[PDB]
Design a protein around this ligand. Sequence first.
Ligand SMILES: [Mg+2]
Lengths: 175, 173
Amino acid sequence: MQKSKFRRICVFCGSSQGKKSSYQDAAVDLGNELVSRNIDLVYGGGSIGLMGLVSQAVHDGGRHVIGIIPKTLMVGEVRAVADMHQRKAEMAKHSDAFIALPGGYGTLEELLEVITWAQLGIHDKPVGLLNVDGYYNSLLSFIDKAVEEGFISPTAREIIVSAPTAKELVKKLEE
Amino acid sequence: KSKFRRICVFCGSSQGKKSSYQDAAVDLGNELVSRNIDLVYGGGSIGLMGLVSQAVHDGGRHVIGIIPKGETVGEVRAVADMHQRKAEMAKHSDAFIALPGGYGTLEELLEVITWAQLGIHDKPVGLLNVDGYYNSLLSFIDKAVEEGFISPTAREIIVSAPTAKELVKKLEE
Ligand SMILES: [Mg+2]
């Protein structure tokens, strides 16, 4: 009955699978959730870890997947671009919102960049965390500390949309 | 003598609510000066960024502020966008320190960490963890390690200490 306001969502996520099967479930559920909403996927190009799970899910479901990789390291369209900065820029340019699954330093750096850009008014695209089994709880508490100490405004804290499942998170992103 | 010619300091463009964070910014500024280290920073004169760069300049060391596109002390470098800015800050620096800050400080810190993890540089990366300000962030990285997303080896990229003196001491390594 309602049309999603997103054509494409950019998903940042671990190149590792993680220790808990809940992580892998969440990556598949996110893929299936995008498919159910007629949203295509933009991602950083893995076939391994959670990156491989969300992309394969979206592909299997019949939607299009765009993976964007630096031209050095070599389902769906593969785009190889000059460098890591051009990769992030292209991922951002072609997406209408951003979702982070659990992941390591790389996922976190990508997520913090798009949040900062929203804070600076560079873009207005929704940014959400798929907070499976409280993976991001200490990150969220760190942001609370930053709000309490006056380094982040209560409004800028609200840039991060968070939910424990894909269905809930995508609902919150539509707004 | 320091092994570092320049340290890049990431820090809040806000001054924060606690006097301890502002005194840490000054103390770090004075630490760099005392060890003959020059400063690279994100530019401007506001927040902790203003406090560290003023202390370094006033102490007679060189300051380079790298900005995209208040006033910047020392040498000002204006670059095309925020990607070039972070690239330039990393290229021209020998170690990195994050004071307390918000999203911008975190964004910059995490990219430096990722680049070290990817083998792009091996410059020391330090957190000036004033009054446990970064405790929750460190708990998150530990969770990431426990759940298999960051190796115990890559967790060691992050050096932490509660004061400027102790931190620069650990970075010298
Ligand atoms: Mg090293």
